[PDB]
Amino acid sequence: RXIXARXXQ
Amino acid sequence: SLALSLTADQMVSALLDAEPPILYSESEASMMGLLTNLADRELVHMINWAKRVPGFVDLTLHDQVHLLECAWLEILMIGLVWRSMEHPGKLLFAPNLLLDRNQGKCVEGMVEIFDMLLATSSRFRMMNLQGEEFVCLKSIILLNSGVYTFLSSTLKSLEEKDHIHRVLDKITDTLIHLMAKAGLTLQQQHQRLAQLLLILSHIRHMSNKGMEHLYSMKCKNVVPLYDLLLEMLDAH
Ligand SMILES: C[C@]12CC[C@@H]3c4ccc(O)cc4CC[C@H]3[C@@H]1CC[C@@H]2O
Structure with missing residues (x-):
């Protein structure tokens, strides 16, 4: 459920 | 809506400003270890470049994510191949890493992918792609x-x-506006637009073999555990 999700935001 | 007013100049500018920086790099395990590490590392400036692509943030946190999971390998190679374009016969993964055809055969089934990568660089080259054109394609x-x-x-x-x-x-x-600048007939112009757009599809194909290959190397536990890269895999 994320890094992709946190960097993109 | 902001994405739709900007013009072919206004546009080709932001696609330029967003450009990620040339990332330097650092057995079959090791070869793959290598492109994975660059691949993982590029895979962050890719995200960052995506956001500053007009219309993207306009998209949805969920659609944003899904375009990226869909296209990530495609953008790596469109970019790969472009970097590789003035280096006939080679894939400029990084500046400090100019892999060659045969170096692709340090990995199972890898050479062939390379082989595809290289031919597009050829194409892009012999067609003479320009950055503006490219930033366009990439988006x-x-x-x-x-x-x-x-x-x-x-x-x-x-x-x-x-x-x-x-x-x-x-x-x-934008692309059109761009091609009109060079001064081609309207034939040659859209003769072009069809030129690039097809290639893309060969890039989807390449991304696809590529995505299978990556997944397999995962299976053999021959790719490091680049958390981000790996999660790019686990959406296919
Ligand atoms: C995805 C692979 C590792 C990452 C490689 C890479 C790594 C960095 C980059 O800028 C482009 C590419 C395209 C080819 C990719 C490879 C094709 C098969 C392999 O799995």
Whole structure:
């Protein structure tokens, strides 16, 4: 459920 | 909506400003260990470049993510191949890493992918792609890969779907505007637009073999555990 999700935001 | 007013100049500028920086790099395990590490590392400036692509943040946190999981390998190679373009016979993965055809055969089934990568660089070269053209293509690719694998059941992802086409259409004008600059007939112009756009599809094909290959090397536990890269895999 994320890094992709946190960097993109 | 901001994405749709900017012009072929106004546009080709932001696609330029967003450009990621040339990332330097650092047995079959090791070879793959190597491109994985660059691949993982590029895979962050890719995200960052995606956001500053007009129309993207306009997209949805969920659609943003899905375009990226769809297109990530495609953008790596469109970029790979472009970097590789003035290096006939070679894939300029980084500056400090100029891999060659035969170096692709340090990995199982890898050479062939390389072989595809290289031919597009050839194409792009002999066709003489320009950065502006490329930034264009790259965004197109980001926008069109995951476009027709959405969850088109929510009328909010049916806004989203037709948005992308509008953008995508704008982008193609941009390209057009661009090609008109060179001074080609309107034949040669859209003779071009068809030129690039096809290649993309060979890039989808390449991304696809590539995505299978990556997944297999995962299986053999021959790729490091680059958390981000790995999670790019685990959405296919
Ligand atoms: C995905 C692979 C590792 C990452 C490689 C890479 C790594 C960095 C980059 O800028 C482009 C590419 C395209 C080819 C990719 C490879 C094709 C098969 C392999 O799995």
